[PDB]
Structure formats: C-alpha cells, structure tokens
Design a protein around this ligand. Sequence first.
Ligand SMILES: CC(C)CN(C(=O)Nc1ccc(F)c(Cl)c1)[C@H](C)c1c[nH]c(=O)c2ccccc12
Ligand SMILES: CC(C)CN(C(=O)Nc1ccc(F)c(Cl)c1)[C@H](C)c1c[nH]c(=O)c2ccccc12
Lengths: 135, 138
Amino acid sequence: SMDIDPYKEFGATVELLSFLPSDFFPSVRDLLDTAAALYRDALESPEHCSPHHTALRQAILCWGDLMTLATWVGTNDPASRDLVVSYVNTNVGLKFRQLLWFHISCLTFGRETVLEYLVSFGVWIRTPPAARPPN
Amino acid sequence: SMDIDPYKEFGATVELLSFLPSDFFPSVRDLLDTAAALYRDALESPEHCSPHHTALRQAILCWGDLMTLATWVGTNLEDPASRDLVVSYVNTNVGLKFRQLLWFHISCLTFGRETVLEYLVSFGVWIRTPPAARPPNA
Ligand SMILES: CC(C)CN(C(=O)Nc1ccc(F)c(Cl)c1)[C@H](C)c1c[nH]c(=O)c2ccccc12
Ligand SMILES: CC(C)CN(C(=O)Nc1ccc(F)c(Cl)c1)[C@H](C)c1c[nH]c(=O)c2ccccc12
C-alpha cells in the first residue's frame, strides 16, 4: 500500500488527533449540521475556497457513502444488521468525528489555535481530576 | 441536507462523469497502483501541492475505510452465499463512484483538467454512435 496521512498537509498527524480522547469530539450528526450551518454556502460553491474546504467536502461525501452501505446492509437479522451499524459508530465514527472536527475547527478558529488548543487539552484532561485546575 | 458535488470545484459534475460508461474506467486496484507509481511522493508530502492532490488523498483514504468495513463484514458473516452478495454490492455501486473519482483526479494531474474534459465528451459521443457506423479510434 501507500502511507498517506489526512492531517499531514495540514500540519498535524493521526497520532496527534488521537491525543484528544474519543468522548471530546461532537457527534457526526452534530458536526454535519454545524458544517451546513456555518459553511453550506462555500462547501456547495464552485470556488476552491481553501484546502480545508476541499478536504471537508470529501469527508462529508465519504461519510455519505459509508452510511449508504450500513443502510443497504440493514435493508438486506435484527441482532446482526443492528450490530453492523453499531461497528460503524464504534470505529470509523471516531475517525470521522476527528476529521470533520479538525476541519470545521480549523476553518472556524484558525489552524494554529486548533493545534495549541489540542495539546493543552490533552495535557489538561490527563492531569488527574484530583489536582486538575478549573474546567 | 447538503448537496455537494465532488467535481464542482474542479469544473465538472457528477452528471458529466456519468456520461462515460461504467466499463471505461480502470479498476480501483489499478487506479490506486497508478496514483502510487506516479504521485506517491507528492501524495505522501506535507505540501498541499494542488487541490487535486488534496482531493485524491481523501479519495484513497476513503476507499481504505470502505474496504476495512467490507472486510470486517465478510469475516463476520459466516455464510459463503452472503459474502458473495456483499462484495457484489461494492463493485456495483461504491466502486463505480470511486473508479470515476480516482480516475478523474489522476488523469487531471497527468494530462490536464481541460484535456480530460474535452476527451470525456468526445468519448461519450463516440461510444454512443452505434458500432455499425462508428469510426476507429476515439
Ligand atoms: C465551543 C467550542 C470552542 C468548544 N470546543 C469545541 O471544539 N467544540 C466544537 C468545535 C467545532 C465544531 F464543529 C463543533 Cl460541532 C464543536 C472545544 C472544547 C474548544 C474549547 N476551547 C477553545 O479555546 C477552543 C479553541 C479551538 C478549538 C476548540 C476549542
Ligand atoms: C493512456 C490513457 C490516456 C488512456 N485512457 C485512460 O483514461 N486510461 C487511464 C487514465 C488514468 C488512469 F489512472 C489509468 Cl490507470 C488509466 C483514455 C482511454 C484516454 C485516451 N485518449 C486520450 O486522449 C485521453 C486524454 C485524457 C484522458 C484519458 C484519455
């Protein structure tokens, strides 16, 4: 195979994004709604806009396909077609939660802010509750 | 919902790429291999390179996710009848989608966006002429 990192050209890495815990990311539904509310305009645009836009467009579309597949599985066993769709939110979901979050956040607050923040938050959430400064 | 066209910002549309028949596109395997042979250096890079490079990166990765899911489903299905109907679905539907998109991007990097689009119309016209009357080389 090849070894491409989605975050590489954006000055980050898969390792770095996994530094944030899995329960810090919004939902996929919420992230898609937010992208729409903040960016539908530019996302549906024919202008490139920015590399972030180009990526996010593909991320959204890709989540599209993944679901259409989990849909088409459950529309083709109540404990099996239900546990297939469960795997998606388990695994890929985290993947997209990260990736959507990264791109929306980078468009909304700046790439640099999103990286400063991500490290601070990982350090901070790993400090045990006992001694952790104010939320 | 949102209505995003992967090709829109690249001066094409889903409609237009559906103009070429489904058997004109190389396989996904062949398209990935070609992306690697020609572009692995740039694809692996930290530079943006071009919007195409950005887009192709995501396409490849996405295909990656789709397979890891189809795999996982097949190694969890049990019946050999039903592993046969899962892999059918992916070639039928998502494959064509990715065959188009991988192709569009690779070719655009290789021969230039305008060429790719001239050619695509020429071919769609030419292949739709019935065989009887159609010239030799598209
Ligand atoms: C209100 C948000 C700033 C909260 N938040 C977060 O990213 N949430 C969020 C970010 C992007 C989203 F699309 C959605 Cl749906 C949610 C995190 C926790 C955050 C907190 N504080 C920050 O200073 C910050 C800066 C950049 C990026 C994120 C943050
Ligand atoms: C050698 C290619 C120019 C052949 N080809 C094609 O698309 N093949 C191809 C294109 C992209 C690929 F990644 C792979 Cl693996 C194969 C088609 C038939 C083609 C033919 N003639 C053309 O003049 C042409 C121009 C632009 C794009 C494609 C073409």
